[PDB]
């Protein structure tokens, strides 16, 4: 025998490490069994439990189920800019009431990034100049570069932007008149010949998605590109 109330009743790394998503419900369970030996509860608690290192008490403890809770009343726990909360870690200490003694078991809560954030255009509109002499496969606009494009606050690929030309029916040529081959420069190139006398400007829809890894929980943005055609 030994007297171990104030131990972990499991094996495992003495840490006890868990995930949630930014932006969870207050009172969102962290943990729903600390599974510290002794009773916190009750007539004659053999153990008292709180929390120590607990920075702007992100975190609550039931000591009678050994419950942590997640405190987000009247704020949001945000991950991205510019909270950048990216882990909370506190210390469950635990008294040995008969005994005297005092240790801390850690918890660490890793934040995840939520696809919560669309891509943004820096401008309302872009604005291209194309010499109908220009040969197709070359490149008219490079107007992206310098995050002059879309950008993209999440983390990863949840903040990573693609491009991709739209049909736009306002202008049903212009998707046949101009491609992104590489979508993540998101840089136009020419694909047919322009000709001034038949057409002077073309009104180009561009998407901006993010690159989450569930394609059902893609955010996507809209511009134009208004290219004019020089004689
Ligand atoms: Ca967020
Ligand atoms: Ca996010
Ligand atoms: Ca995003």
Redesign the pocket.
């Known amino acids: 025998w030994q007297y171990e109330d104030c131990k972990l009743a499991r094996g495992g790394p003495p840490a006890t490490i868990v995930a949630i998503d ?1 932006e969870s419900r207050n009172g969102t369970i962290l943990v729903d069994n600390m599974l510290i030996k002794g009773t916190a509860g009750g007539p004659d608690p053999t153990i008292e439990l709180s929390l120590k290192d607990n920075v702007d008490y992100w975190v609550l403890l039931d000591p009678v189920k050994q419950m942590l809770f997640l405190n987000s009343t009247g704020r949001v726990l945000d ?2 800019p510019p909270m950048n909360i990216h882990s909370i870690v506190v210390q469950v200490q635990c008294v040995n009431k008969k005994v005297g003694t005092v240790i801390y078991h850690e918890v660490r809560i890793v934040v995840r ?5 669309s891509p943004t255009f820096k401008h309302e509109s872009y604005y291209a100049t194309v010499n109908e002499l220009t040969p197709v496969g070359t490149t008219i606009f490079t107007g992206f570069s310098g995050d002059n494009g879309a950008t993209d ?3 990863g690929p ?1 903040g990573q932007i693609e491009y991709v030309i739209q049909y736009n029916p306002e202008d049903p040529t212009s998707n046949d008149t101009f491609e992104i081959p590489l979508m993540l420069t998101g840089n136009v190139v020419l694909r047919k010949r322009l000709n001034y006398e038949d057409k002077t400007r073309y009104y180009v829809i561009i998407q901006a998605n993010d690159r989450a890894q569930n394609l059902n929980e893609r955010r996507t943005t809209t511009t134009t590109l208004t290219v004019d055609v020089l004689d």
Request: no cysteine.
């Open positions: 930014e991950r991205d990034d939520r696809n919560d954030n606050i999440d983390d949840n």
